[PDB]
Design a protein around this ligand. Sequence first.
Ligand SMILES: CCN(CC)CCC[C@@H](C)Nc1ccnc2cc(Cl)ccc12
Lengths: 81, 78
Amino acid sequence: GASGDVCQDCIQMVTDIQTAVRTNSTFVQALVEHVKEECDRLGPGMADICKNYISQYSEIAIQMMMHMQPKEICALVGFCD
Amino acid sequence: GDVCQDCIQMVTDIQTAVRTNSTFVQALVEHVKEECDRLGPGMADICKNYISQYSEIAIQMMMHMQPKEICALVGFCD
Ligand SMILES: CCN(CC)CCC[C@@H](C)Nc1ccnc2cc(Cl)ccc12
């Protein structure tokens, strides 16, 4: 059903994200920089803290993500199971 | 390019799931709240409260945005 379609879509997306992290040298940098820019949407005070949190934990989060299976990442976010 | 299209496909199906499955949103929000426990004591409650404060906003914004817009917002497209 529809929930089942979302799960498979997530597995497909996550598999390709991992292939991008391994084969595209500018992928991670472009994503992290973009998410830092999105911190501006939260507030004047919140944006500075948000940007600092991403800078601090981005590498570890990507490294953690890379040692997980696509279905595990999707089950973690809630798109699978 | 593949990631962008995968995101558009996933987001289109999420919007279909929200419109056709009456328990989808509730199950997702409750699941993400349960995942806050991985942050351990102290941080778990702060995380659960952030979910309870932004879930409606995030879901409504997501339901009124096009799949490509949501994907460009997260950074998977453009
Ligand atoms: C929320 C914190 N995140 C960082 C992204 C840590 C992710 C750690 C866990 C869930 N992932 C996992 C990593 C490795 N094996 C697993 C096996 C099972 Cl059954 C479930 C989850 C697993």
